[PDB]
């Protein structure tokens, strides 16, 4: 995976370089000499993460621009997968935001402590003397704690009164909440909570844009540095402003920079959400609604110029059920068909609302956003394949099989695919009976066309014909390797991770290294 390695190494370099660079820009130069004695080394430790966060804060919103990335795919296979790790990149970039935010916050806790301590004559003489600046006219403070409130109440006062402190507290709460509600448990069991509380990025970014507006972290100005030679003027602080050589130094603060970094990504994400709104408005007529047993309804629907590839999924917004939310459902229909369909299991409040609106128990207004997902158009490339689906993961394989029949009837000569072995791993066929009917149908079409050998499928019950218990992968791989010698076998699976590791192990173990042997090529959804 050289491309994603390289992105992470450029990204991590451009964080390490920024850390070291904005560390040394606030540590070495004599512009920050006086501020580095009031704040010590904890100044640069606070400002290097600031620039690192500036860079990471653009890099978070970009990969989650799903409509812009849809347009970029439209403008456009391993590299396609690598650029489909946008969510993984988002995750790690947000995690390193958390790291650098922790460093920034800790260093600023040190800064606030040492800026209240010096203000109340509880530090070394020089820092206390430096905190005295800014009290009177014609002098700019260096210590941003101005009221003589003793610690630890003084630090709290600065937090609840300084704009930087208030915004930092707010956006740190809004970041911790995002992180804690973006654990796999919430992102996979209560995705409603994840998506709602993950919309604190707006508050995070609004607070972050105005975070550095006060310019409290101040360094000595260029003109002051020109008139105020520090190596001469450091030890004569008690008489500053009272000799020719040493005027009172003037400290200004660096103008806010974060907005310059983040407006591009925020503009791009708002554009993304406007494309999503437009996809919402784009009309989608629901041609037919079959309700397969055990509370699953399939929506045959037609939208203006909708193109899709096998294995892709669409988000379905129903304004009547829910105005804000988008619910993804795997496309279960072949690209050739005029209508694109999805099967929805009625397991929750939004699907139940769609069920009631459809009238299965007039039709609801639904909106379709994007044929997103990783295209599985390479299934047809190989001469033999092993389609494996467990539980709910079998759904995209339905669309794959439907498209296989269309490629067999339309061309029958350009179909590189020759053989299907399908394995379905469900506790019971209690929610996917339509898929069972699908497999019976495809077997029937193969038998009627005098090509019954095309599709072989077995159903296994964890709790051809259905079987009990998990399949013996060792024996199955050996059997089909004996069946097909010196040909590539593409193994496709959508299911548990342990199952994926199992299939990887058997694929490597049963594959022959030489080109004159059988190669088992595993692909995982």
């Amino acid at each position: 995976e050289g491309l994603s390695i390289f992105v992470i190494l450029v990204w991590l370099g451009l964080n390490v370089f920024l850390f070291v660079w904005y560390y040394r820009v606030y540590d070495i130069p004599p512009k920050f000499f006086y501020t580095r004695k009031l704040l010590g080394s904890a100044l640069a430790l606070a400002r290097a993460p600031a620039a690192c966060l500036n860079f990471n804060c653009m890099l978070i919103l970009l990969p989650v621009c799903r409509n812009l990335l849809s347009f970029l795919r439209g403008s456009s296979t391993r590299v396609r997968r690598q650029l489909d790790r946008n969510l993984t990149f988002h995750k790690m970039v947000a995690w390193m935001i958390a790291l650098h935010s922790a460093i920034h916050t800790i260093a600023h806790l040190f800064n606030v402590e040492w800026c209240v301590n010096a203000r109340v004559n509880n530090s070394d003489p020089y820092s206390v003397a430096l905190s005295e600046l800014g009290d009177r006219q014609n002098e700019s403070y260096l210590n941003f704690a101005r009221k003589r409130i003793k610690n630890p109440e003084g630090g709290l006062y600065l937090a609840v009164t300084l704009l930087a402190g208030i915004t930092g507290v707010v956006i740190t709460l809004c970041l911790i909440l995002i992180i804690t509600s973006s654990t796999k448990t919430i992102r996979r069991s209560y995705f409603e909570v994840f998506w709602y509380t993950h919309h604190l990025f707006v508050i995070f970014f609004i607070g972050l844009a105005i975070h550095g507006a006060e310019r409290i972290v101040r360094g000595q100005t260029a003109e002051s540095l020109a008139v105020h030679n520090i190596t001469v003027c450091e030890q004569k602080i008690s008489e500053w402003g009272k000799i020719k050589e040493c005027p009172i130094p003037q400290f200004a603060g660096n103008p806010p920079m974060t907005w310059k970094w983040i407006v591009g990504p925020m503009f791009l994400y708002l554009c993304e959400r406007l494309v999503r709104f437009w996809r919402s408005q784009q009309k989608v007529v629901i041609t037919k609604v079959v309700t397969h047993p055990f509370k699953t309804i399939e929506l045959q629907m037609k939208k203006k110029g909708f193109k899709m590839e096998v294995g892709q999924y669409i988000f379905v917004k129903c304004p009547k059920v829910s105005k804000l939310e988008w619910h993804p459902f795997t496309l279960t229909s072949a690209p050739e068909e005029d209508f694109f369909s999805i099967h929805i299991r009625i397991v929750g409040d939004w699907t139940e609302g769609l069920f009631n609106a459809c009238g299965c128990d007039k039709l609801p207004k639904i909106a379709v956003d994007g044929p997103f997902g990783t295209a599985s158009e390479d299934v047809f490339s190989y001469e033999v394949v092993m389609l494996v689906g467990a539980g709910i993961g079998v759904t995209p394989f339905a669309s794959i099989l439907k498209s296989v029949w269309y490629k067999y009837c339309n061309n029958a000569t350009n179909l590189k695919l020759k053989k299907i072995y399908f394995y379905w791993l469900c506790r019971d066929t209690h929610a996917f009976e339509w898929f069972a009917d699908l497999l019976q149908l495809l077997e029937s079409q193969m038998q009627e066309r005098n090509n019954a050998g095309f599709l072989s499928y077995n159903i296994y019950l964890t709790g051809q014909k259905t079987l009990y218990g998990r399949p013996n992968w060792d024996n199955e791989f050996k059997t089909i390797a004996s069946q097909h010698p010196n040909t590539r076998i593409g193994v496709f699976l959508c299911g548990p991770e342990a199952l994926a590791e199992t299939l990887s192990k058997q694929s490597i173990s049963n594959s022959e290294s030489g080109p004159r042997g059988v190669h088992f090529i595993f692909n995982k959804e």
């Epitope: 005295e132 009177r136 008690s238 009272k242 000799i243 020719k244």
Partner: antibody, heavy 119, light 107 residues
Framework: DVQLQESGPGLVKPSQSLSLTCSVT?????????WSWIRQFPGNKLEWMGY???????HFNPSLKSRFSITRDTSKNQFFLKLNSVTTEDTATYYC????????????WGQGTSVTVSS | DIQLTQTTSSLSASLGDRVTISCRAS??????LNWYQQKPDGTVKLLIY???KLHSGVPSRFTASGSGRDYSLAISNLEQEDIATYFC?????????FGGGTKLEIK
């Protein structure tokens, strides 16, 4: 060390102009300090009159309208008080002082000159 | 102009007795108050600046302390050279207003 003498007319007439000289010996005005002219009225009531900085900048008490001004003779190492249109209330003991601290404290004061205004 | 008021216009005490001279500023001054001692012959000399910093050269018995508006000068043990008027001056905002003064009379 540094010592300040005030020298000037001890009895000016009302509506005249008062001109007081402060001679500094152990320090030069251009080397650096704020050189004030605090005066004490009868009844022991001090008020900051106005200072001239080392750079030559001079700042006045606004209670003194525009009737008060400070100049200096750096060659002779001395600075001067100049009150236009002196009134009867201008009678006071004028102390010329040196202010070398960033805390604006007058460490060295003069002995003072008692200026009287009467007809 | 900020008005510095010394409530004690005149105070009496004995030798070797603690005396406190307190003055209050009409507006908050950021510890920017200085203390001067004017001898009866009119010689003024700085005692403390910034409300705590003892001017190099005056006896250690002069200790001053205060915050915000209220400031005080304390002398531990009195002798005959402490007969003098004591002024508190701000330097926080121009004009640098002085205090009323406080004469010390030994009993």
């Amino acid at each position: 060390d540094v010592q300040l003498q005030e020298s000037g007319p001890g009895l000016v007439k009302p509506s005249q102009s008062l001109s007081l000289t402060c001679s500094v010996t152990g320090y030069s005005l251009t080397s650096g300090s704020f050189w004030s002219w605090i005066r004490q009225f009868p009844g022991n009531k001090l008020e900051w009159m106005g200072y001239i900085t080392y750079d030559g900048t001079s700042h006045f008490n606004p209670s003194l309208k525009s009737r008060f001004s400070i100049t200096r003779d750096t060659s002779k190492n001395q600075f001067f008080l100049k009150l236009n249109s002196v009134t009867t209330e201008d009678t006071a003991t004028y102390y010329c002082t040196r202010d070398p601290y960033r805390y604006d404290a007058m460490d060295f004061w003069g002995q003072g000159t008692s200026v009287t205004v009467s007809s | 102009d900020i008005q510095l008021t010394q409530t004690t216009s005149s105070l009496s005490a004995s030798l070797g007795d603690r005396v406190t001279i307190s003055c209050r500023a009409s507006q908050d001054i950021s510890n920017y108050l200085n203390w001067y001692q004017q001898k009866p012959d009119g010689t003024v000399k700085l005692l403390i600046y910034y409300t705590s910093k003892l001017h190099s050269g005056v006896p250690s018995r002069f200790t001053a302390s205060g915050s915000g508006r209220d400031y005080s000068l304390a002398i531990s043990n009195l002798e005959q050279e402490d007969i003098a008027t004591y002024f508190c001056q701000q330097v926080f905002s121009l004009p640098w207003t002085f205090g009323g003064g406080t004469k010390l009379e030994i009993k």
